[PDB]
Amino acid sequence: GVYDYKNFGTADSKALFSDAMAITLYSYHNLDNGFAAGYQHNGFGLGLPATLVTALLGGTDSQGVIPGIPWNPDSEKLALDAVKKAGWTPITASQLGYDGKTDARGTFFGEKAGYTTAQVEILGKYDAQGHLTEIGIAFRGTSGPRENLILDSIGDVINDLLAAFGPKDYAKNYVGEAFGNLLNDVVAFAKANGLSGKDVLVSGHSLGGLAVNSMADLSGGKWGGFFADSNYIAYASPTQSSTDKVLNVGYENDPVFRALDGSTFTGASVGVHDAPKESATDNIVSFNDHYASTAWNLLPFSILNIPTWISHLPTAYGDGMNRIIESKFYDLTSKDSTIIVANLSDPARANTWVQDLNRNAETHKGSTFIIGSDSNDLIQGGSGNDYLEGRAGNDTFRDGGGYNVILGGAGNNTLDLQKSVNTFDFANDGAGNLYVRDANGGISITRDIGSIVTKEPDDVTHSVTASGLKVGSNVTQYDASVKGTNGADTLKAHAGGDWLFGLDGNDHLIGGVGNDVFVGGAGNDLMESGGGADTFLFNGAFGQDRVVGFTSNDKLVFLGVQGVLPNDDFRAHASMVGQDTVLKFGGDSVTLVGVALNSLSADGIVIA
């Protein structure tokens, strides 16, 4: 998964991530709520001024920067409720025996001259019995309490500038200078409750993400080494720690994220700074109105170009990256997977195709994951390999080719092929999967898409049904198939070639002399070629399969399988066990009985 941390599992990394995000959002007290809400209603073009109005004054359903407006919701109380729902309660100055500054909200303030506009939240997670199980440390990014926002932000900006232009270790030392004493008190509080370093989660966004990385850098040597084994997840940090301790998360089109190299100002800092970084998720795109706009991007991409900071908004981090977490494709992803998160305004969503424009970024490689909104989206896959997720709402998909998984989700979803129905083959396994094979052999596996649109010289809409694609009474037939059951089946192909669908269970698929398409499905399947030019398709947790009679003109296709790193080919996954080539993908495998590994070519083995 993209947010895998240390040696924690997929699940435990996700739980850690969701908490780091919750506490990160809490630290800003919904300051960007009005901005996020303005943007969602108005967009970033024409309506940019209306968006900015709401950033300042909010409206009937959001609070901007300005406090005390009667018709605004109490966003700060919503922020507190939200962090509590996630399991977190602010630890008071008095619980910690802390003698520095807090405000009326329990926020901690930086301790030394030059650091007094620093903010941190210290939070506790408590079990059913009311015992402390976890501590959250959430450093605030640039900005402060609504009461003193301008003055506090000026202080923060000086700190921001010093990270780039000040003493060499200025970023590294920031948490040491700002909260050295506070953190000694946190160590005593943790010890007193039977906790150690491993029970502490450290997070924050932007300047707060800089602080995450500062704390990691100081953790070996300061506070008695107590925090050395803590959990550090930083959002949109300009810096990266010298250590291996920090998961540096952000959007690649956020100009704050990785602006510095790990603390160094370079020529790239004021432009595109998208070089691969070991600690960082390098390829997550916020597909927002700015990113989509041809006119916006006639201007140079730069932290100095203020409208580019739309991709920096903490609500867009929380909302879009939570949908990554929730994705049916999540466990296919790793740290540097290309993921395009649908983050369009309401007006832009109506007429803009979410797609990998690869704008202002180094060239994307490997498969692409595109994550929709819970509203009606237009999602456009590339000509390489795509995982398209609609989520809720009536979604429309296009895709330029290759090997794809298209999940409609809830709603009435539509796949627009933009070409004649005669240039495709269709197959259906009777268990919710519609297979679409294009004129070049590329296969899409689709679920929850009930309508196919084609061009017939010009748009024609086909209903996806059990007997074929239907335009009223008119049927485009599915390719010849033998459907199994979720029981163990023996299925035999006709000499003309068939699609063979195992479904669950350990199945025996017997190909014939024709061109068959084998889909063993879940369970450990035995699949025999029988001759011809055959395709074997593996998707999801496909089991341990054996393929008999695989030859030179046969194709393996791996799609939606575990452990595929961006751009992996078959050699990353192939070995010889006895006289057989084995291809392994997570816990799943294909055994090509009697096939020498040196006989295989990438044109015969599709890895997506």
Next chain:
Amino acid sequence: GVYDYKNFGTADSKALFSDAMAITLYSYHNLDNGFAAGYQHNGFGLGLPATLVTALLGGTDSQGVIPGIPWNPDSEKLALDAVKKAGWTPITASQLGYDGKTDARGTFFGEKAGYTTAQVEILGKYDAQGHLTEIGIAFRGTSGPRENLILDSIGDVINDLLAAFGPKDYAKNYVGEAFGNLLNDVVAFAKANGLSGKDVLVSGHSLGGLAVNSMADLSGGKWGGFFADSNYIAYASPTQSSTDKVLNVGYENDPVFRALDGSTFTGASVGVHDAPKESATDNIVSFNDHYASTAWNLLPFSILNIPTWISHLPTAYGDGMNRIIESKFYDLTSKDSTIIVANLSDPARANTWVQDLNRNAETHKGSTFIIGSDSNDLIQGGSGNDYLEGRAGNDTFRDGGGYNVILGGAGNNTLDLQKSVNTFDFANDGAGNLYVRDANGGISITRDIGSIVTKEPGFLWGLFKDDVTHSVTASGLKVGSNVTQYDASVKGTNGADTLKAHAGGDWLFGLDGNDHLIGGVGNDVFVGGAGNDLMESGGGADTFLFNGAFGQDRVVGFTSNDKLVFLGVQGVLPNDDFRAHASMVGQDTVLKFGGDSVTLVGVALNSLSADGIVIA
């Protein structure tokens, strides 16, 4: 004057400048109206979020960037009315037989790909019988019609960056590309109405400023050299043409103004870029809440730091520099005079002293002019020579020393001396001038200041201090029963007088007419006044004061320990000394200031000392 242009002279260059601003402001159609008004009410600190709200949404008495808000006034109609009141009516595409694009306001739009967001207004002035007398060309700075603000602004900023980073002479060619055909039709419409190049005034602000300079660069070769001798006044231009045709007016703390040299991006472009430029007004400060703030100025001054852009606003240009135009000190100033304009918000004005902080600029040289607002101001002159103008409102002045003129203006005004009344001498000519002399001999000439505040040793033998308000009266400064006497005086009349000093020393006030002022052995202060005055020392350490149109005067018996003081006199370029004004005529040293002169009968120029000749 600071805005003298070509050879139009003082008065006509001022009228030209007021037209330029009028049409410049028109081109923006009151876009910054809500910002100006939000700033005035809220300021730029704690009040900033509210200021920005008003910038976007306006209010009941302003319109911000967003059109069609029912309760805003129609600020676009107000702009049109304003430009008309100034004598100008936009010329239709039809009168020009122009085939390009205009919008519903009659604004002309740029003609080629990459210039379609350029905007220009073409306006005409008309005599009493309806004939055209003058054409105005106002190029719009970045921004465009409210209908399409953002996309239009994007196009403009793309143009802005190409001026910095694009083809050599991109800025020079901007008007050629954007408005080449428009300008051919204007030449033909000018000729058909009997006008030539000299009846055309070309202006605009920011990128509209860059366009002024472009048009001047191109005027020799294009359009048949028709506009070669046109009139060119640019505001807040990032660029300066290679010609001698452009007056480049701006605030020195406006980060856009002179950002480029004169179309070249340097290391200074993103910082302070305050090198003297021949074509530019180099030393005008917008004294605004940003400029005044210690907190704001922790951040580096740069065009890249958006809050510094407060000094760029066209309304603050209009309002600020029109007060310079109107100043009683105007005709003392020259292109590079240090002028500080009171531009504070209502909240900051109540507690912030307007002063030359010399922030984010080269060291200011020469006398300083500080121009107040029509409200109650706090104005602080420096330790060098100052001209402080309160205007209307109840103003309070302070000043650090030197030789000064302090015009209280209308209102109840106060001079706060911040130390003991005993450390000053006071004189009064009965013609409205109260002279204030400090312990170092520094003299301030004050008008319309009815109160003097001093700081006196008070309780516990001077541990504590009392602030004492004296009223300026005919018999002296008065606080209750206590009268601070004026220094001994002889006063003339507005006709020709002979006035004799007593042996202890007198202030001798000639007033108008050709007077004979006879000094004594004492230390006299001579003020010949208007007219041609003969003034004899008589011995002692004497002072001769010259202010205004002081005439052709003769000084007899001037020695080593005497002193001339020129204050509020013509032709004093920033930091002039006597040498730039002095010559020998026969046996005498003559000092010349505009049409006024002092002859130091018998004195050799070589014997003179900057010590004894104060030029302010």
